[PDB]
């Protein structure tokens, strides 16, 4: 298993610059791309940029275009952040994408950047142990209507994990209690037999076929279990 380690975070004044590093423990022919995903404290996930294994493909979110630059060096991937703003304050993760599975197949630990001065989901959901809970994801023709859906689970203070890829497929280690589906421009995550460990945030995800710099992540759903 490849291990990813982010570094470079710290305190910076607005307008300043900072370079983050994503280090991979070893090369892998399965991993073809490396993403950066950030999360402001208490907010949702936001995809930042991606670079292919050979550096020839690079894409950025519109919220960082022109200010951020992704690059790599032979086992390191760099994110050069210029003209930093308070909105850029977030934990920055890097995540590799393999030739199968989902957009973000494994993740690092995160590095915090502090700058000193659309897929809609229900904000919250709940259930009792053993209950069946469904989480909706409402998109458009350009994203869900045109591309596969992913689902990601995030426990408090930890990096998210891939739950569902290719609309309805589970990676290894995901129980069959989780299932996904997609119809038209909407998608849904279903959790049968809700367990206490399922209390987490859940994000749907789908790439946009028109203007891909818009965003990939859903708004996120906080699921609480009433014991
Ligand atoms: K590689
Ligand atoms: K993948």
Numbering used by the authors: 1 to 74, 77 to 119, 144 to 253
Please give sentences taken from the publication describing this entry.
In summary, we generated conditional antibodies whose binding affinity to a target antigen is modulated by a small molecule. In this specific case, we selected MTX, an FDA-approved drug, and CD33, a well-studied and validated antigen for AML therapies, to highlight the application of the conditional antibody technology to CAR T cells. In order to determine if the molecular mechanism of MTX binding in the VHH was maintained after pairing it with an antibody light-chain variable domain, we determined the structures of a conditional scFv in the absence and presence of MTX using anti-CD33 scFv P02_D09, a highly MTX-sensitive scFv. We demonstrated how these antibodies can be used to generate conditional CAR T cells with target-specific cytotoxicity whose activity can be reversibly attenuated by the addition of a small molecule to potentially mitigate therapy-associated toxicities.
In addition, the VH:VL interface seen in both the apo and MTX-bound scFv structures are similar to the VH:VL interface in the structure of parental M2J1 antibody. Mutation of select amino acids of the VHH framework back to the parental M2J1 sequence successfully restore the VH:VL interface with sidechain positions essentially superimposable between structures.
